[PDB]
Amino acid sequence: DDEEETYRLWKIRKTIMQLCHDRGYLVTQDGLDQTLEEFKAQFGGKPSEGRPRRTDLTVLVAHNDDPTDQMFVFFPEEPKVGIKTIKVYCQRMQEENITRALIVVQQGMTPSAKQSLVDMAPKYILEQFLQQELLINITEHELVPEHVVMTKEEVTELLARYKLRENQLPRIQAGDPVARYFGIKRGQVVKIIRPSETAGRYITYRLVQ
Amino acid sequence: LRRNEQNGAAAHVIAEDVKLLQFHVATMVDNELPGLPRAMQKSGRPLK
Amino acid sequence: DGLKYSLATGNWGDQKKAHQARAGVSQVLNRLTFASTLSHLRRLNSPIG
DNA sequence: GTCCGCCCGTTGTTTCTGTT
DNA sequence: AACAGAAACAACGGGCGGAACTATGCCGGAC
RNA sequence: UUUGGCAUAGUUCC
Hints:
The structure is cut from a larger assembly and holds chains A (209 residues), B (48 residues) and C (49 residues). Chain A is α/β, with parallel strands linked by helices and 209 residues long. Chain A folds into two domains: 1-136, Dna-directed Rna Polymerases I, Ii, And Iii 27 Kd Polypeptide, Chain: A, domain 1, CATH 3.40.1340; 137-209, Alpha-Beta Complex (Eukaryotic RPB6 RNA polymerase subunit), CATH 3.90.940.20. Helices cover 34% and strands 23% of the residues of chain A. In chain A, strand 9 (189-194) and strand 10 form a beta hairpin. Chain B contains two helices and no strands. Chain B has helices at residues 2-7, 13-29. The longest helix of chain B has 17 residues, at 13-29. Chain B is elongated. Helix content of chain C is 33%, strand content 0%. The chains are: A alpha/beta (209), B mainly alpha (48), C mainly alpha (49). Chains in contact: B-C. Chain B binds chain C through residues 43-44, and chain C through 15-19. The structure holds three DNA and RNA strands. It is classed as transcription. The entry lists the keywords RNA polymerase II, transcription inhibition, electron cryomicroscopy, electron cryotomography, transcription.
């Protein structure tokens, strides 16, 4: 229904706003907190034959440390994103001089498109997120402790302090849900902060590999 | 097999003997392959 | 020899094929007490593993 | 002294779509 | 039209408690 | 003051 489609689009947008806020990009409080009626008013309460058509919802936002480093959040209108769609998006990124971009998919992407996304990794960074994976924020679930991405400086200092080689840390897969949420590549180290029953707090470290 | 390959065979005795030696060596290594003759020596007791 | 062997060992079958032969028939009679003897002579068995 | 009973990790086979 | 990436189903193989104490039969056959 | 093994059955204790 139109109400359900508006609701899904609004929830996806809200989760992506939270994702960008966690990733350090600059999203304002009003953008973060939109009511369903406010979103209906601003960008159409009728999706079918209406203003919101999985386009004009694309988000361009600049990182808090560099306005030159910006990210896109594209909404393909096709249930199966294809090679030509990926090429169109990469062309738009090239013309706007944008390095990173997110892509929310209706149902899925063909393996050819996924490999054509992987191939241009040093040139461009693009990530695929399903429509179902963003209706909720996995970070807010109580089973998920807080994750903090650590800078290379923090990593070096930690390794020197404990006299550890990076082989000797616990690991976390690059396909992990939270790892994809934070957009972490191999070789980065995340920090886990969680309360403890016997100490009151315990900070762990995980290596993305 | 040495004697046969010295004195000349009938192009199939050599192959059968090669297969038999292969079976004996394989059963010496492991005597539990699926679908094998399961070599025994006496009284029907399989080897070790 | 066939009857004597099958009764002596308990492997119910031919000697050459004592692999699938069901062992556990023809046990040696218990003689610790008269009750032991009687309860041995009146005994059943379920071949379940 | 010679001959003769249940579970579930791998790998295959086959199939079904995407690109050019 | 040819090729290639990913997946459903089928077949195969290894895995299955810990100790201890008695007894009995047998370890190739013909010539 | 010298050393057999394979299999099967029964029994004890958790």
